[PDB]
Amino acid sequence: HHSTGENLYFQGSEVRSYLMEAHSLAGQWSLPNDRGDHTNSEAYDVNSVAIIGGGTMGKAMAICFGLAGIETFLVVRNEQRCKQELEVMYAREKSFKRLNDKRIEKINANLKITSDFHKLSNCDLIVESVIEDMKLKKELFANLENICKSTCIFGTNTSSLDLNEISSVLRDPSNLVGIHFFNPANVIRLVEIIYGSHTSSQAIATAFQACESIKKLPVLVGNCKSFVFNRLLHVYFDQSQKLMYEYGYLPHQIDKIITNFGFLMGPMTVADMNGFDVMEKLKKENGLEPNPIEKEMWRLKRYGRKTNKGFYKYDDKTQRKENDTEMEQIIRRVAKSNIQIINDQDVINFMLYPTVNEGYRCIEEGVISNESLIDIMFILGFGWPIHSGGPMRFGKTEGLDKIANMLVHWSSLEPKESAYIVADALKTAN
Ligand SMILES: [Zn+2]
Prior knowledge:
The chain is α/β, with parallel strands linked by helices.
């Protein structure tokens, strides 16, 4: 989960994230019922960390801890392949300006690659990022218990396995917690701290403080919220596509409006980054139906950066983004729409209002709590129309009333599109 840039769509720019993060209450965490909270929970200091597994997430997490000046062991099967893979990663990240030689120097002075466990006995936090094999994970933690100090918090980045199974094998199952970083990890600050049924307040506090010390922004949740992000993403992005085929907007125009609003990157830019084949492979699983722009683009196998052409074009040298004339022909070639879009503000509303509504849809369906969703979106830098203090500036609006009205009005002109059907939880919060 989260390993293919799904949350880049929602990542705020440095400034917008600066301004939006202040409104998250996620630091004020509580476990369910009477299990403990941030007022009554002791955090052990994290002076030393271990990340088990040298895959993409393993490497990305180890980089994050190393960058902060924390002694980090990266425990892998093949130390030599690992150092090689890490070099490719360093080079790719610099090319995106996510890292530079000075920060790589700091990582390297703190990062120790190894395949030996008896190096870990003084580690305060160990996060497993191995293959999704229940028996392997069980034995690995069962293994670490009788070699690590009793204060050691065990993290697992598992997506497909049940956190309680894995704990079901420690003598002390209270120190196992789920920890999800988000790709790309030098860009997205959000981290999910996922509690099991037995996860202790200490484990929670220790993980929280650890993430904070590495300049990440943790949130406490009862399960992984990938489903939520996917749902938000698909609504956001479908709207974004309508701007191209129903209206005459070109990728750089949409993306410019989005980045002007304060997002780090526009949707077409992000889709190219992530590989637009991902979207095709999705409908290849439950076909279909592909919209005019997708239909034609997938034919031409324009998948983004990996195919050097996508919504943009990427020249061969330093792989630099440039506008593409063939893409515009596809756009021009496809009157239309009763819904009015005349200016930049309407463009933003067309994209963001239906995304906000889908969040409320997730809330009322029990997929996510109201508080979790809102803290997450502030942390991402996306923002929210409403916060704990009441109405919140969200573009050229505040609160939910104009949003609710615009959605019902859009539902009038297009009553078949679910994206405009207002949720009861939205009406409620309004
Ligand atoms: Zn997750």
